[PDB]
Each structure stands twice: as C-alpha cells, then as structure tokens.
C-alpha cells in the first residue's frame, strides 16, 4: 500500500457533469485534472470505486489520482473503498477541495482538522479520520449559510477564477515535494503563495 507521509493518493472533490465542471465546488477537480495532464496520468472510468481514477509516475513515485463521481456529499462512497482497497493510509492522502474560509488566490496545505462545513470532507472524515492532507483552494464565502449552496455551485467571475488558477498552478509545482514526503517544505511554500 502507501509508505509513510509520501503522498501516493491525490483526490480532487467536485460534482460530475458539464453543468458543474466550471463551478467553485469543483476546485479540487481542476487541480487534479491539471496535475494528471502535467504528469501524463490517465484519468479513466473507475465504476468499481464510483469515480474516475488514474495511476502513474510522479517524480519517480507510483501515485494514484481519484475524482469521485458520486456527487460531492457522497464523496466518501468513492474515497473510502478506493483508499482501503489500495491500502493507502490517510497520512499518504492529499484531498484537494474548495475552501469557503479563504480568499480566491489563497491556497494552503493543511494536515488534519475538521471538514469546515465542506459537504465532501464531511462524507470522508467519519470513515478514515482526519489525518489526511488537504489542499485548501480559497473560493471565498457568500456571507449567508443560506447562500453557500448557490456560491459553491456558481461559476466565479474572471478575476476570482484567475486568482484561483494562479494558486492551483503554484500548488502543481509543489506536488514533487509531497510525493517525496517533504510535507513541511510543501506546506511552507504552498502557504506562502501570493497572487501579486
């Protein structure tokens, strides 16, 4: 299976379908789709684990990618059996997800903690516990808890999309550190990111 805190599973959270592909709740998908293209990892149909997955070499490490196709609030119905099947401990998992509590263009690597009301993480933490790594992609907050659904299922204005895209591109450049188990250095260099 996995080996220490060498990241060997990278999960991107989001919703299936073209109507959700450009929404803020798919920030995790954006990051994983771009990572898969950067490293030539095929993301193929994975009906067994209710998602799209791939396996390939990142900087000399055997790494798996997963996009749940369960819809966001059932994400755990893909991530939990996939990670158990391949014997990947949470400490070797990175989950990329949209973060309401951070600005567009802010990105952070966090180890552990709660779901912060994220309905994808809410479906994962009760099964594998909190001790996986998260790539928190800032998307900002709409003000109301009543407005959160419409914000996360919205398509961000170009300025915010540009800020997110820059942050995601920065994070792609730091995955080499994560697959090598250099979580502290990755966390310092990801968290330091500034758009301008």
TrEMBL record:
The record marks 98 as: Stabilizes the basic form of H active site to accept a proton. Pfam families: Pept_tRNA_hydro (PF01195). InterPro entries: Pept_tRNA_hydro, Pept_tRNA_hydro_CS, Pept_tRNA_hydro_sf. TRNA binds at residues 20, 71, 73, 119. Its main location: cytoplasm. The active site is at 25 (proton acceptor). Its EC number is 3.1.1.29. It catalyses: an N-acyl-L-alpha-aminoacyl-tRNA + H2O = an N-acyl-L-amino acid + a tRNA + H(+). SUPFAM superfamilies: Peptidyl-tRNA hydrolase-like (SSF53178). The record marks 15 as: Discriminates between blocked and unblocked aminoacyl-tRNA. One of its GO terms (molecular function) is peptidyl-tRNA hydrolase activity. It is an enzyme of class 3 (hydrolase). One of its GO terms (biological process) is protein quality control for misfolded or incompletely synthesized proteins. Cytidine binds at residues 73, 119. The keyword Mitochondrion does not apply. It is found in: Cytoplasm. Belongs to the PTH family. This is Peptidyl-tRNA hydrolase. It comes from Acinetobacter baumannii (strain ATCC 19606 / DSM 30007 / JCM 6841 / CCUG 19606 / CIP 70.34 / NBRC 109757 / NCIMB 12457 / NCTC 12156 / 81).
């Amino acid at each position: 299976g996995s080996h220490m805190s060498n990241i060997s599973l990278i999960v991107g959270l989001g919703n299936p379908g073209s109507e959700y592909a450009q929404t803020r709740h798919n920030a995790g998908f954006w990051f994983v789709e771009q990572l898969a293209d950067k490293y030539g990892i095929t993301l193929k149909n994975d009906p067994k684990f209710h998602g799209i997955s791939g396996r390939g070499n990142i900087e000399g490490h055997d790494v798996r990618l997963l996009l749940p196709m369960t819809y966001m609030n059932r994400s755990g119905q893909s991530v939990v059996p996939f990670s158990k099947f391949y014997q990947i401990a949470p400490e070797a998992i990175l989950i990329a997800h949209d973060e309401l509590d951070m600005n567009p263009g802010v990105i952070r690597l966090k180890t552990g903690g709660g779901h912060g009301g994220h309905n994808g993480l809410r479906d994962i933490v009760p099964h594998i516990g909190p001790n996986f790594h998260r790539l928190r992609i800032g998307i900002g907050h709409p003000g109301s808890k009543e407005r959160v659904s419409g914000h996360v299922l919205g398509k961000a204005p170009s300025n915010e999309q540009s800020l997110m895209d820059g942050a995601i591109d920065h994070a792609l450049s730091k995955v080499k550190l994560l697959v090598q188990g250099q979580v502290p250095q990755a966390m310092n260099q990801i968290n330091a990111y500034k758009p301008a």
